[PDB]
Amino acid sequence: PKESDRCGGCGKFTHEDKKNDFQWIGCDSCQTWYHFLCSGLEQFEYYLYEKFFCPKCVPHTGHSIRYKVVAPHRYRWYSPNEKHLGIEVGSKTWIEDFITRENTVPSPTDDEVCIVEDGYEFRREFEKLGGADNWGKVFMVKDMDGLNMTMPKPGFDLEDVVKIMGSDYEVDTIDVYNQSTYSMKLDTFRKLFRDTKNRPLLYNFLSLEFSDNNEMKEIAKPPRFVQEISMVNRLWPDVSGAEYIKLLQREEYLPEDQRPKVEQFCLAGMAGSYTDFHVDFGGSSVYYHILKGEKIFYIAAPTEQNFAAYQAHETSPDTTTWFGDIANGAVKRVVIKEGQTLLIPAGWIHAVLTPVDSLVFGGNFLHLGNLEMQMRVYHLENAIRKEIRSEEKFYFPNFELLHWMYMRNVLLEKITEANQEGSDMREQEKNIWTASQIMKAEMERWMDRELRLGPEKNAILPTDDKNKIMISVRKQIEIQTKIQNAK
Amino acid sequence: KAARKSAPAS
Amino acid sequence: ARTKQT
Ligand SMILES: O=C(O)CNC(=O)C(=O)O
């Protein structure tokens, strides 16, 4: 091929292959082409420079010249043809103003959020309301004592993180004023973060999942209660020696690379960060602890009125209206300060402002208590995905697969036992019974869809295996309903 | 746009 | 910046 189309480099035509993609960038000086990953740039930089300005040119050309902030109220702030368009949520201009008027949104009712003093108090109130089977309101815990939730010692901060994880460790970072996501080196984030005076752009990452880092995963953990109801945890138990061998002996082993990795996240944001309204993926519940700084959550109850508002807001092309202004006073304000812990069940629609440089440890989880709401949110996601194109990474990893395995490995067992024994399940296993009915109904839909128009890409679960699971499920459910026409 | 918790599968 | 995709 032509030599002007050779990196770079790398001195190759094709880059072996985070991912370079088949992506390139040309020097506006030496005019040669580089693979993106041979350019020296990090993904968050790909759109920043009008001029670039490779390594072989900088000591004599100067550092790359970045676009002029021509329109700070647009996501494309660098674009002149957008100077005249409206103010977008939450661009630099929008946030700037919002920081001053934001305090007018109402506090929540006691029916929506329950603020307790510590983990012990939480437990009481929690049980009062039916525990996790009947978990519908968010809780804010002013002190973590009594939650049995491992957290590092304060004074612990961003530095220890980039040291434990490594400085080259890349993480999906939100370019705030641009309301987009790009990979950034932990070390590169630390630099920008530590420069408190010069922040031409703001960054906030929420997606540093460390469950797989032998050090980190030991330093910050979910509350005991979260672990006890986590469906992911139940399917991929942290087990060893004979327990693990047994797990293998029963065909109950699942690969670690199939595990939804979402229960252990570190988050860090620059002052001024705003994350726009969303529901957490898969309708997952959240634990969220402030190690440093402060967050302001703007929240709305998982009602059908609110969902319908949210779905329309999410599918409309409008970009200039805060969802709070169309929500008919559904949005409430809750401030979370250093050392305080938020616990959000399935459904809650929320946005968050970061008043102050921050560091947080949190995680997402699925539990049977919120099965129905979890499926409701899944329907909400899928309906939005029909109108708007998004990346699967912003959705719950292996949602369906998880449910396929939970039925096969957990539920399918219990039902069969009762069917062999007595045994009407509504006696000490009612919760289990209803969970099954719900799970199967949704699963029959997936099976239906899969059958009406084909399976996804290659893997993971073959159609015939889903059916064989289903065949088994229908039988035992069919069989159990009978038992429920005597007892 | 695309500014939300991100968690590849995997 | 002038980019490209193959
Ligand atoms: O911290 C932020 O900017 C946003 N985080 C969330 O919305 C969450 O963890 O559920």
Ligand SMILES: [Fe+2]
């Ligand atoms: Fe969230």
Ligand SMILES: [Zn+2]
């Ligand atoms: Zn190259």
Ligand SMILES: [Zn+2]
């Ligand atoms: Zn050059």
